[PDB]
Design a protein around this ligand. Sequence first.
Ligand SMILES: CCCCCCCC/C=C\CCCCCCCC(=O)N[C@@H](CO[C@@H]1O[C@H](CO)[C@H](O)[C@H](O)[C@H]1O)[C@H](O)/C=C/CCCCCCCCCCCCC
Length: 211
Amino acid sequence: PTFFSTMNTSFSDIELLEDSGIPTEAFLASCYAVVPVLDKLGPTVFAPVKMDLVGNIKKVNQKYITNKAKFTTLQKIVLHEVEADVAQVRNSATEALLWLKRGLKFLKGFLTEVKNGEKDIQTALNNAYGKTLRQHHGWVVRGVFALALRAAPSYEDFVAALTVKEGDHQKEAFSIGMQRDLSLYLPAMEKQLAILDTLYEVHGLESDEVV
Ligand SMILES: CCCCCCCC/C=C\CCCCCCCC(=O)N[C@@H](CO[C@@H]1O[C@H](CO)[C@H](O)[C@H](O)[C@H]1O)[C@H](O)/C=C/CCCCCCCCCCCCC
């Protein structure tokens, strides 16, 4: 096994509910799962990333826990905010999920480069950044990304952070397992992100604001 098939981690183990509903807890658990990897790779240097993710998961969860029966899916949360005219209120779940999906599109891009055989982690990150998050960042935040990029792990340190037992990365079985697991993880994520993108587009929730 690899990190990408560990319990609660994979987007591929999330089954959709009626009307393509994305279950709230399972989705948020998949988002959280990368946090310990960030901590293995750079507890200080990637702290902005960790804080962003944790904060957005918190903001979605804060609405969820208010009425779990009502808020069984992401769509139910967003659509309630829209009905209540609170999607634009500070700390909304709609805003938190906007930034979660943006961050996941970046993660998907980066892991696709890796899956397709990119061994330069900086190249992989920077290629994915340009296509995803860069458009949403201003000058100062682009500078923070550039700082993070300089501190990118070696390929070996990166894959070592994705093993279930130390040393696994030196086995061919692991490379095969990475391919197996990413070949499920990535299209499952894509499917969910497409659902979310449609939801945001249709309801006029894709904000043009940059940070
Ligand atoms: C599988 C194991 C792989 C390990 C993970 C490595 C890749 C990490 C990839 C994705 C994780 C998610 C990235 C987080 C992107 C931050 C989202 C972002 O642009 N959030 C914005 C806006 O913030 C919003 O502000 C709003 C108000 O204006 C609200 O307050 C919202 O709540 C709030 O979110 C925030 O200003 C920026 C935060 C951090 C940007 C730092 C540069 C990112 C470095 C990239 C990762 C490096 C990879 C590590 C090495 C492999």
